[PDB]
Design a protein around this nucleic acid. Structure first.
Length: 90
DNA sequence: CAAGGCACATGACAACGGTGTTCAGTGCCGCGTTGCCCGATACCCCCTACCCGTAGTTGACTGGCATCCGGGCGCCGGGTCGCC
């Protein structure tokens, strides 16, 4: 909590793990795994409770991987925003 | 010389003259205002042209910006860390 909140935002980015090819391809594999898990859960057909909880856990892990990609690439957006700054928008 | 007999005019007499009222009736005609007939018009339709919003675009491309000093001047007031 300081002045010039952009500096605070960069500090909020902090140190996060940059992803090498294997890392993000595996992460996206887990993303589509969670996608299929939630697709199965959304179906009105009855699924066993333990299987439904497992699918929910897989979907949650997928969400975490999404967040990891977001935070890792936060640095990428800040550079792109600088690429367009100084045109009447903050 | 006085009395009796004839002319012209005379006290009224109505009835025309001419015109003024009045009745009483019926209109005459003053303006106000109705019933027409047209021209334009606002209000439905169809058509397409162009504005306005939405959705994509695959080598790679991973942290920015320039601040700010010569007020000046003092005070309040709180915070802030030493102090013994």
């Amino acid at each position: 909590a300081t002045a010039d909140p952009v500096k605070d935002y960069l500090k909020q980015i902090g140190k996060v793990p940059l992803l090498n090819a294997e890392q993000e391809v595996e992460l996206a594999k887990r993303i589509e795994a969670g996608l299929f898990a939630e697709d199965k859960l959304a179906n009105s057909d009855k699924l066993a409770p333990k299987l439904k909880r497992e699918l929910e856990i897989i979907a949650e892990d997928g969400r975490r991987a999404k967040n990891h990609l977001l935070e890792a690439n936060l640095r990428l957006v800040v550079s792109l925003a600088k690429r367009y700054t100084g045109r009447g928008m903050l």
